[PDB]
Amino acid sequence: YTRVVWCAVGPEEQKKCQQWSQQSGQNVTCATASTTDDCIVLVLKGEADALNLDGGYIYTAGKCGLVPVLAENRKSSKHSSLDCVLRPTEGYLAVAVVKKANEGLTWNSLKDKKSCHTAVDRTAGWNIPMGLIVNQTGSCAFDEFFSQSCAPGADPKSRLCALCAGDDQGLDKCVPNSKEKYYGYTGAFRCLAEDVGDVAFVKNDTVWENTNGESTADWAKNLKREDFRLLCLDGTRKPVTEAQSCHLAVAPNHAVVSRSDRAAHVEQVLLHQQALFGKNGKNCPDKFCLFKSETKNLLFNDNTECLAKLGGRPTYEEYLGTEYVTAIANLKKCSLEACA
Ligand SMILES: *[C@@H]1O[C@H](CO)[C@@H](O[C@@H]2O[C@H](CO)[C@@H](O[C@@H]3O[C@H](CO)[C@@H](O[C@H]4O[C@H](CO)[C@@H](O[C@H]5O[C@H](CO)[C@@H](O[C@H]6O[C@H](CO)[C@@H](O)[C@H](O)[C@@H]6O)[C@H](O)[C@@H]5O)[C@H](O)[C@@H]4O)[C@H](O)[C@@H]3O)[C@H](O)[C@H]2NC(C)=O)[C@H](O)[C@H]1NC(C)=O
Ligand SMILES: *[C@@H]1O[C@H](CO)[C@@H](O[C@@H]2O[C@H](CO)[C@@H](O[C@@H]3O[C@H](CO)[C@@H](O)[C@H](O)[C@@H]3O)[C@H](O)[C@H]2NC(C)=O)[C@H](O)[C@H]1NC(C)=O
Ligand SMILES: *[C@@H]1O[C@H](CO)[C@@H](O)[C@H](O)[C@H]1NC(C)=O
Ligand SMILES: [Fe+3]
Ligand SMILES: [Zn+2]
Numbered sequence: 001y002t003r004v005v006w007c008a009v010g011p012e013e014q015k016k017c018q019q020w021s022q023q024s025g026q027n028v029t030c031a032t033a034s035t036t037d038d039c040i041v042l043v044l045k046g047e048a049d050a051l052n053l054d055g056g057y058i059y060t061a062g063k064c065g066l067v068p069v070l071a072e073n074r075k076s077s078k079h080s081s082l083d084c085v086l087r088p089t090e091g092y093l094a095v096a097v098v099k100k101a102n103e104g105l106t107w108n109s110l111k112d113k114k115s116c117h118t119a120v121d122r123t124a125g126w127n128i129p130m131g132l133i134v135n136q137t138g139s140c141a142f143d144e145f146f147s148q149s150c151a152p153g154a155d156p157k158s159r160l161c162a163l164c165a166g167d168d169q170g171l172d173k174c175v176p177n178s179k180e181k182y183y184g185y186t187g188a189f190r191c192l193a194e195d196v197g198d199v200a201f202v203k204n205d206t207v208w209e210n211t212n213g214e215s216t217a218d219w220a221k222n223l224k225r226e227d228f229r230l231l232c233l234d235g236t237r238k239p240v241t242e243a244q245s246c247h248l249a250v251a252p253n254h255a256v257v258s259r260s261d262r263a264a265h266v267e268q269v270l271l272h273q274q275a276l277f278g279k280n281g282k283n284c285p286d287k288f289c290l291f292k293s294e295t296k297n298l299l300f301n302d303n304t305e306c307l308a309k310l311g312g313r314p315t316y317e318e319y320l321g322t323e324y325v326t327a328i329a330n331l332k333k334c335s336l337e338a339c340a
């Protein structure tokens with residue numbers, strides 16, 4: 001009754017959710033689906049209560065009537081006075097990243113190169129870059145722009161899936177979940193770093209969390225920030241320390257969504273769960289930490305300080321902001337359960 005069914009996407013999120021479930025005394029339970037879109041349907045049906053979603057999916061979920069409940073909040077320098085849960089969200093920086101040794105590559109010469117995206121329909125991996133390109137290009141043929149790409153969630157037989165790798169056994173190629181090797185923020189950066197693609201569309205934090213010894217991960221043990229460059233909209237290349245003057249846009253933080261009729265309940269439970277397993281929670285380091293998953297960003301992003309209340313009880317459009325919402329609509333003109 002006062003229990004919440006979390007929806008996990010893929011088997012790695014399933015295992016993490018199962019651990020959370022066990023540590024919660026069954027206050028949290030788990031439903032699992034192969035894609036985020038499916039998890040969304042599970043929530044609409046009332047078979048699942050909630051999940052955390054990137055902005056692009058919140059637009060999908062919002063049209064079907066789901067609402068924003070609480071947002072991911074990472075630690076910041078400004079607004080230091082307020083507590084994390086009451087602290088305003090800041091938004092993340094969407095960037096395009098390349099190897100510095102790849103001289104001569106700029107925003108203006110991306111056509112026909114190889115791209116690495118977090119997944120179709122996500123903010124920094126798809127909506128922002130492809131929105132910009134369709135525009136600058138006056139064409140809806142975003143599938144013919146790059147020569148080859150890894151964009152999880154596209155047709156496995158298309159060039160958009162040419163560079164995706166699948167799992168250990170080469171199965172599940174291009175599925176939009178963590179079984180795909182190049183899925184998500186981490187997977188797209190790895191696609192760039194192993195030199196599978198020429199550019200990766202992720203967010204600023206990703207570059208920082210996987211270089212200069214921050215990851216220990218085999219593929220990233222030896223990655224140095226100086227070996228990378230951000231591509232700016234004015235045709236310039238800059239070091240990753242200049243993300244504030246060289247980004248594609250500021251994205252709205254990922255947020256937990258649920259059915260509006262379940263919102264108050266989902267909110268209550270999560271605030272208590274984070275007091276127990278959050279950053280400074282009663283049992284985090286010692287028993288279970290909600291916001292940790294070895295650089296894999298399972299259920300929540302690993303750099304999450306807390307889940308914050310929203311303020312102004314915003315609809316989904318208000319949460320994403322008028323700038324972002326029109327960007328998506330315009331892109332969608334190129335391309336229930338599509339409820340509107
Ligand atoms: C782009 O994204 C980045 C990444 O999110 C933003 O950079 C962050 O900026 C914030 C606020 O502006 C910085 O605030 C600091 O946060 C730190 C916590 O991460 C605090 O510093 C301590 O804790 C760090 C984490 O443990 C630690 O790491 C940093 O420094 C060392 C050496 O320089 C390196 O790694 C160390 O820690 C890791 C943890 O796993 C460990 O593996 C190592 O063994 C080291 O112990 C690493 O390079 C990293 O930079 C510090 O050593 C220190 O102990 C600090 O108190 C303060 O709150 C935040 O540090 C920045 N994030 C990182 C990871 O660099 C950036 O602002 C974004 N840009 C824009 C424009 O928005
Ligand atoms: C790709 O191109 C489209 C078409 O221009 C861009 O959409 C346009 O973007 C601007 C920014 O939001 C919109 O202008 C705004 O309009 C409102 C009122 O209409 C005004 O209050 C704001 O101050 C601002 O001027 C414009 O409406 C919108 N055009 C349409 C037809 O919806 C789009 O943003 C571009 N894509 C990306 C990803 O940048
Ligand atoms: C489970 O929820 C009940 C009711 O709120 C509460 O007594 C208990 O603190 C919760 N336990 C855990 C581990 O979340
Ligand atoms: Fe995102
Ligand atoms: Zn800006």
Ligand SMILES: [Zn+2]
Binds near residue numbers: 312313314315318
């Ligand atoms: Zn409002």
